[PDB]
Design an enzyme around this catalytic site. Sequence first.
Site, mmCIF file in Angstrom:
data_model
loop_
_atom_site.group_PDB
_atom_site.id
_atom_site.type_symbol
_atom_site.label_atom_id
_atom_site.label_comp_id
_atom_site.label_asym_id
_atom_site.label_seq_id
_atom_site.Cartn_x
_atom_site.Cartn_y
_atom_site.Cartn_z
ATOM 1 N N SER B 46 -31.213 -56.539 51.978
ATOM 2 C CA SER B 46 -30.119 -56.912 52.898
ATOM 3 C C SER B 46 -28.783 -57.328 52.277
ATOM 4 C CB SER B 46 -30.611 -57.909 53.984
ATOM 5 O OG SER B 46 -31.418 -57.124 54.885
ATOM 6 N N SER B 94 -29.356 -60.243 59.818
ATOM 7 C CA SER B 94 -29.786 -59.135 58.977
ATOM 8 C C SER B 94 -30.569 -58.042 59.783
ATOM 9 C CB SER B 94 -30.580 -59.707 57.774
ATOM 10 O OG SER B 94 -30.888 -58.632 56.917
ATOM 11 N N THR B 185 -28.404 -63.394 52.202
ATOM 12 C CA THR B 185 -29.718 -63.223 51.666
ATOM 13 C C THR B 185 -30.182 -61.753 51.696
ATOM 14 O OG1 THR B 185 -30.697 -63.617 53.872
ATOM 15 C CG2 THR B 185 -30.533 -65.483 52.508
ATOM 16 N N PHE B 187 -34.301 -59.612 51.028
ATOM 17 C CA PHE B 187 -35.749 -59.592 50.779
ATOM 18 C C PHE B 187 -36.317 -58.153 50.955
ATOM 19 C CE2 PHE B 187 -39.995 -60.763 52.900
ATOM 20 C CZ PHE B 187 -40.663 -60.775 51.754
ATOM 21 N N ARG B 229 -35.417 -68.814 47.532
ATOM 22 C CA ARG B 229 -34.217 -67.980 47.194
ATOM 23 C C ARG B 229 -32.934 -68.750 47.526
ATOM 24 N NH1 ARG B 229 -34.216 -63.366 52.027
ATOM 25 N NH2 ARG B 229 -34.168 -64.868 53.750
#
Lengths: 241, 243
Positions: B46, B94, B185, B187, B229
Amino acid sequence: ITENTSWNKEFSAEAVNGVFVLCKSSSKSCATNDLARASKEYLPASTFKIPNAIIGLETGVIKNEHQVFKWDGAMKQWERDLTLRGAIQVSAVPVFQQIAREVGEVRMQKYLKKFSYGNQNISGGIDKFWLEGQLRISAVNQVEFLESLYLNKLSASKENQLIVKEALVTEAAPEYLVHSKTGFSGVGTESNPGVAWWVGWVEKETEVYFFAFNMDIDNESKLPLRKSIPTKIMESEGIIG
Amino acid sequence: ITENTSWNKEFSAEAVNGVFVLCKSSSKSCATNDLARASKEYLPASTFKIPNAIIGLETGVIKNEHQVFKWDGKPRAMKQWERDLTLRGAIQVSAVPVFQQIAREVGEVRMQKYLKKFSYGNQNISGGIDKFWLEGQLRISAVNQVEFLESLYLNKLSASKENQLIVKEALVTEAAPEYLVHSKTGFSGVGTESNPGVAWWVGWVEKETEVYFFAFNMDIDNESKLPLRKSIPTKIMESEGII
């Protein structure tokens, strides 16, 4: 614009005289507690920083988004270096007084005319007209001005309007964003009160709401009502939750 | 860039294998916990929404800052995505399907061009136009993310300044009068124990008149560790007085 007198309850409990204007989507759909006061014109105080910052950028008095306002070397606040955002969001009288002097009265007048900013009266001193001078603006006119900025429709470059908009961000979550600005002319007396403001817009999911609040202030302890009254009204309309 | 071995302390507790890059003022002054890892290239997942959004606007696929991405009412992988979203919303929650559709409209030729201009990673978009950043061959390092984000901060990317500013506001995640964070962020997934996925947090912090640029990535094979994170980098920044 329609009147909702039930909103008065939020003011009465604190014995405050004021007004709240709230518009969903556009200025075509506004409500207020007091139609008369909604159109009364008050000194803008620090809400003037919004147009002052845009004029500053358009004219070049402010160079770009990343300009730093360095302290040259009575208020602690005024002895620190600030970004544009910092100058807008914290007390910085010397910064804006200098911007206004550099813009000058002819150019200041042209821009207020283009922006339809209140009564457009800037007499009283180039570096203090918005605080102790003759300038006056209504809550309705604040909402109209802010909607134009939101849409990038002011007579200013889109880039400068975007720069100012980032500096006004005061709350941020994934689907809730607030742009706002306070203003306060000072604590007056019961018969000659000052005025306090809170203006801005809330983007919630895909809706946008424009708002402008003002109130007479004669007691230093009442200042935080400038945020709590609008918040309570907004809450009762379902915006906050 | 120098290596700050003491930062490893923040990874040892949770046994995390990852890296943090922090730059004060510009990318000519950087510190990291793992010199090797800082230049290693991983799927951006993302974090790719940042260039994807800029490219969307530059190509006219995204009309302007106020464009609403309408939900067609059909099932999405996440409940948080099942609604109309603004550009800021789509980025912040996201919403992968929104950006897959953007990519398709941008198309391979234009995407390749913009990533070349942006110096983005290995610039490899093979794997399908709507999945190269999620499961394909695109790879970028923490130090490359920091370079790209500084360009964006300074408006030096090859895109209009208006568009860079739009994406900038969409990345705001924390605001105070003299403190502002822009971040994203990422993932990829949990991969396997042997080929784990990657998790990221990249961004910049404006504190008073200083700017700090940062990127963090870590190996991940258990979703329950996802919050590290943000928490690991946050702990390092706070210990440096960035709070």
